[PDB]
Design a protein around this ligand. Structure first.
Ligand SMILES: [Cu+2]
Ligand SMILES: [Cu+2]
Ligand SMILES: [Zn+2]
Ligand SMILES: [Zn+2]
Lengths: 153, 153
């Protein structure tokens, strides 16, 4: 696959659409779109392991972490594959997302297709928060919206 | 992987959960679960090509058809890889889904992870109807509910 897409929804007002593009096998992945209904500020943004929304976003499990690393930010060597950092909303509640990432993929063992993208209640501290949870979740709190990442046209 | 899941959502509520299991990559896929909120009778049931719900189930495109075949039933050689036939709802509006299929897969070129499962308004005629559409869509009509197929734990 070269293109993927995710519709983010949850139980509250947070909703969005996120697109992915990967031009080349083993090249970087462009990630772009918009999320609305958010509180102003940073909100953690990750790919979680399972594309399972059976009981809502909780069913998606932990961060996608095929290489058994600690949590980090997207520009860290020490990160989960799924660690895409934060999106940032304005007072208007909108986060415009524009990310390139070279660790996620749309094929192979780092593939994110069929997994869940999640936007969080709180900021992700990118593993620099100095408690144990920082190293696992980034202290980003509950899951406000999510969706399964699908193959796109 | 060897398990996948799909949450179907549409107006009614037409709602359902479908589980997938494939014991080995060269093996059949067990498909099972429940869909509620349906009218009594047969409803077409297929994997569509794109895991895109941007604008609702319409965004998923046509039946998943990597081999460029005509529409058929699941037992037919001439079928789309996505052709899973019909589910049947009782007077209570529930369809008990219990399928094994050897053409879909959870890995490889026929993988359905990241694609959309759809349940339709009307019966699928399994390509045996009296017109040209039968060999494309089975005449199953609109899309009552769908979801993106994700990797499960
Ligand atoms: Cu997350
Ligand atoms: Cu269909
Ligand atoms: Zn992480
Ligand atoms: Zn078909």
């Amino acid at each position: 696959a070269t293109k993927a897409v995710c519709v983010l929804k949850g139980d509250g007002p947070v909703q969005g659409i996120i697109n992915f593009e990967q031009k080349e096998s083993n090249g970087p992945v462009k990630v772009w779109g918009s999320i609305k209904g958010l509180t102003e500020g940073l909100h953690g943004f990750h790919v979680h392991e399972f594309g399972d929304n059976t009981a809502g976003c909780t069913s998606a499990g932990p961060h996608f972490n095929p290489l058994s690393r600690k949590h980090g930010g997207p520009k860290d060597e020490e990160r989960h594959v799924g660690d895409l950092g934060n999106v940032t909303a304005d007072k208007d509640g909108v986060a415009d997302v524009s990310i390139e990432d070279s660790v996620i993929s749309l094929s192979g063992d780092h593939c994110i297709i069929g997994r869940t993208l999640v936007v969080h209640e709180k900021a992700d501290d990118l593993g620099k928060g100095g408690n144990e949870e920082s190293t696992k979740t980034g202290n980003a709190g509950s899951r406000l919206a999510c969706g399964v990442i699908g193959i796109a046209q």
